[PDB]
Design an enzyme around this catalytic site. Structure first.
Site, PDB file in Angstrom:
ATOM      1  N   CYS A  76      -6.403  -7.496   0.357  1.00  0.00           N
ATOM      2  CA  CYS A  76      -6.660  -8.812   0.914  1.00  0.00           C
ATOM      3  C   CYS A  76      -7.692  -8.716   2.036  1.00  0.00           C
ATOM      4  O   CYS A  76      -8.556  -9.598   2.146  1.00  0.00           O
ATOM      5  CB  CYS A  76      -5.380  -9.524   1.341  1.00  0.00           C
ATOM      6  SG  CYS A  76      -4.500  -8.643   2.645  1.00  0.00           S
ATOM      7  N   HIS A  98      -3.833  -8.609  11.454  1.00  0.00           N
ATOM      8  CA  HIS A  98      -3.089  -8.600  10.208  1.00  0.00           C
ATOM      9  C   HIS A  98      -1.686  -9.142  10.487  1.00  0.00           C
ATOM     10  O   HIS A  98      -0.887  -8.527  11.180  1.00  0.00           O
ATOM     11  CB  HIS A  98      -2.993  -7.150   9.661  1.00  0.00           C
ATOM     12  CG  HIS A  98      -2.177  -7.044   8.427  1.00  0.00           C
ATOM     13  ND1 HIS A  98      -2.637  -7.485   7.200  1.00  0.00           N
ATOM     14  CD2 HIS A  98      -0.904  -6.655   8.232  1.00  0.00           C
ATOM     15  CE1 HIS A  98      -1.681  -7.318   6.284  1.00  0.00           C
ATOM     16  NE2 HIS A  98      -0.612  -6.811   6.887  1.00  0.00           N
TER      17      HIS A  98
END
Ligand code: NA
Ligand code: NA
Ligand code: NA
Ligand code: NA
Ligand code: NA
Ligand code: NA
Ligand code: NA
Ligand code: NA
Ligand code: NA
Lengths: 318, 317, 316, 318
Positions: free
Chosen positions: A148, A175
């Site tokens: 991602c 993150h």
């Protein structure tokens, strides 16, 4: 329609099911899950982050979701016994995390099965990011959709490189781990956790000319789903806030339509839950310093952007 | 001892009280608080982040904390009525947030009270960061100790500039917020990008560098321990090891007690209540090309700054 | 349509706007807010918890939301200068927290404006909870809609009393929040607080209020709270009979007010729920002949806000 | 001193190490851990919740912590090969979660090993809660220290039963977390109700009361400090003041060091690392009618229990 099977019903598999079910030229012919059927249906229907979803069991105990009205449900842990060819699956979306290598995932390539897309970085595996290097695809039977974080970073690097020529860049990923190396041995808890993430190598797989010129890291933060990439770039060509804004806005209209977006509304992270974009540029926070340096930030849902690109790639390689 | 008074018992005021109480050559002579006496005592004693702390009320209802055994407690909101001079204070630590300007804080100056340190950026006010430009102090009566973010980033900038010559830098603060339209958003568990005037803030203490830097903050819902992330472009060539070495050497010498290095691969909660202005993340230092580096550092957004506040009190006395 | 004005655009004011905008028989004719127009618009459109909502600005700088096509936007802190009468508002939804008393909110009453519903407990104010005692309304001009906690607990108390006859009950609200304890940092702590449960219940169920008491535990999660009732009854109970009594009420007298979760869901699944309470079916338990524990979810903004508008439609 | 070994260095094993290291009549002679030595030392020294702790490596690669200056470090997963007798261990604190049964943990009973205390509920195993039923101990070689939940609620039930006679009680545990379908959902930020077999758990340590009590838990995403909420119906009439007095009196006497009272109106984080099984929230005690009361009490999920685990070690050694 293109007939796909989804292997694994963790977060990525679940999101892939939901995304694929909404694509008119895809048919999900099979899901393989460690969950019992009724649990699987529950998990598809009810999601702590992405909300409720319509799904039903047919009389014959197949699943019925969107355009996929006849989904066979399997529960076989042994890849060598698992037979997606019996469901006429063409493309396997490999989402278990147990076969993230060329050799392991090749075991799916049985009889009528045509291709495998691994939903993670994979050892020795040709790697593609939709919008970045997917047009370099050359009939490989087993590919990786990267991570991602790469799917967010790599489009932005490509746009900015094409516009101003990247000399060097430093990337920080913020993150969001709420729904997701000695520092790993500690409870995550509510800690901020720096981690090395092999950014240079990861970028090298999809932008080989840039990988050697970029590095960075991640900071894990206890917020849900929506992450941020922070790019600090040094270019050959001189830049201004306006010229950088323009280059990103223009790419979103053209070569990166449907992949990169711009937020001009000064929104916050929760506003991007379930966003389909690989990256959403934070327009107002674009800044330059000196003649040649810029900072660009972009949001992404660390599940949904990636899952939309995963199914984009399925459609493309078919 | 140097006689100080603390105005305001929000988070910074409380931390300043705790810090000052442990310094032998400081005497806290007065605290002005909007809280009732008993509430104030409770807040000094019990802290959700920094833990439990010993404090008592004397018979005569003055406070008794560490080396400060006779602290007068006041509750006067009007700065023109407030009289820290009655307790023979010489320095005010101005922590209310209501007087963050030269004009406003000059109201404190009367009788024995000769100096004010504002615990925030302040309009038109001489600004100092300990370790960075405090030696340029020239007996000014009202000064600002800048922000917690500037106290972390300015030392790092000065060390690295001296070593390698900063051409430009970008600074992202990851600002822990548990304790502009985006501010109208009930923060909840949002990440929130914020402009913060980095260039101007750095210009106040490093005039040569301020124009060569900018950046922003990302507000994150974790408590106290923040991180600054510096992306620098230098004139001289760098490597992970040479950057590491320059930072390590500074922590032994000119920034001893101000900047520290973490070589133990710790996480944010490990630095709660740290006294340092910045704690460099040694293992996460990186470089790319010949001239660019990324440097991260932790700081407790209360305790580092509060330690510096009292360091600055002792220095200007 | 019944013409209403919303005073205050905090969380409850915003949710009341959104709810009212979707009801065909309601017209929002004014909103008063301390926010600038463009900021108000943003806050209606974008919500960290309830998601995105469609809202537009007209050329004349009125708001256009759902069935409310021409909403006057005001910004006036003084209740005496403020005049919802100019938009022909009949009913005020008073959501500022600044006038939570009969005396204070009476100042709204002028011209077209006949009635005020205060979106909180209010001193000396007739208090109603929809489905509990709203049918006792006799045309009062200033009323209170009580709290979100009381809207959850009172229905359940009423159902279970009618079925089994409450002797006594203890209530704990787990209140999702994202007195010296109030000086302590919210985020980072479980915080017990007294909440005057008995008095609050007495306002809407006078016979029951003296038989019940309780407290709240403030917890740093968003929006979805839980009420935990421990009841002692005169008649005997079982999980099954308690389950049945609650299920039947959800079909009949409390339809649209109380619901049952039979799907074993978790708190985040009830974000934006319109119910005053959702009973956790599988967690109903009894012990001895006479004691039961009943839990129920509620969104502490949305159920209450649905009730606010329900009450507006009712008292009109 | 009593020679103990700690099997497992998850959260409970780590806390047990720290607690046992501070007890003058205990010597930890061995720790068995899945972690490498240097990682174990790091985990003992640095804790996201309980803060920093002094520990050193000796030249001979034993650990040196507090009164335990010679701790042998093992890394053997197979219980049949693990030889704590080689370190002359007498008492094993079984903290792995892999052997929570009488049969499984009895494998520890080799050579010079005298006793095992399991740091969890365990099938078919005699169960004890210090201050509640430990004086009923009768030389059993394998015992369970129950759960942290039972360690908080059982003392309160015993005190209140002795004072006023429990007819019935309902218990809610608010459990701070940092087949049951709710467990298939990543906890996330959710409040999560869970059945916890309260009646049976209480029956093990207070057999006369277990049949009269039941309850549940609500999992909440806060760290370490939990709350128990008891709603009780008594035979004898009670008042707020009488309940307050009964609890206060017990803390001075039969439950000294086990139950305490908070009269300072503190909040959850104030009790991080508390050694008490339960800290009564004195100001929030309430009654309704003649016979009913609600009593709340804090506990650290780890520390109270770990203190009791080592208390039990010391007790059974004698
Ligand atoms: Na003042
Ligand atoms: Na210097
Ligand atoms: Na360190
Ligand atoms: Na600092
Ligand atoms: Na009761
Ligand atoms: Na148990
Ligand atoms: Na004890
Ligand atoms: Na306990
Ligand atoms: Na003890």
């Amino acid at each position: 329609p293109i007939r796909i099977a989804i292997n694994g019903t963790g977060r990525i598999g679940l999101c892939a099911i939901r995304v694929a079910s909404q694509r008119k030229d895809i048919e999900i012919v099979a899901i393989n899950s460690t969950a019992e059927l009724e649990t699987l249906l529950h998990l598809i229907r009810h999601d702590s982050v992405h909300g409720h979803f319509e799904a039903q069991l047919n009389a014959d105990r197949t699943l019925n979701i969107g355009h996929s009205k006849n989904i066979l449900v399997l529960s076989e842990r042994d890849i060598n016994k698992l037979d997606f060819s019996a469901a006429n699956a063409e493309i396997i979306i490999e989402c278990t995390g147990k076969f993230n290598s060329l050799e392991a995932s090749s075991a799916h390539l049985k009889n009528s099965v045509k291709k495998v897309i691994i939903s993670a970085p994979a050892q020795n595996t040709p790697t593609f990011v939709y919008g970045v290097n997917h047009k370099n695809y050359h009939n490989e039977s087993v590919i990786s959709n990267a991570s991602c974080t790469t799917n967010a970073s790599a489009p932005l690097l490509k746009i900015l490189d094409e516009a101003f020529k990247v000399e060097n860049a430093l990337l920080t990923t913020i993150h969001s781990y709420t729904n997701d190396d000695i520092r790993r041995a500690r409870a995550a808890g509510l800690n901020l956790i720096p981690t090395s993430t092999g950014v240079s190598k990861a970028i090298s797989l999809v932008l080989p000319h840039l990988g050697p010129k970029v590095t960075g890291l991640a900071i894990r933060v206890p917020t849900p789903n929506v992450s941020l990439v922070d790019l600090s770039l040094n270019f050959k060509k001189s830049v201004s806030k306006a010229s950088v804004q323009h280059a990103l806005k223009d790419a979103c209209k053209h070569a990166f339509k449907g992949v990169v977006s711009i937020d001009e509304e000064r929104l916050v992270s929760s506003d991007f839950i379930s966003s389909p974009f690989s990256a959403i540029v934070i327009d107002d926070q674009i800044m330059t310093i000196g003649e040649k340096n810029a900072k660009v930030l972009a949001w992404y849902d660390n599940e949904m952007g990636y899952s939309e690109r995963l199914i984009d790639m399925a459609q493309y390689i078919a």
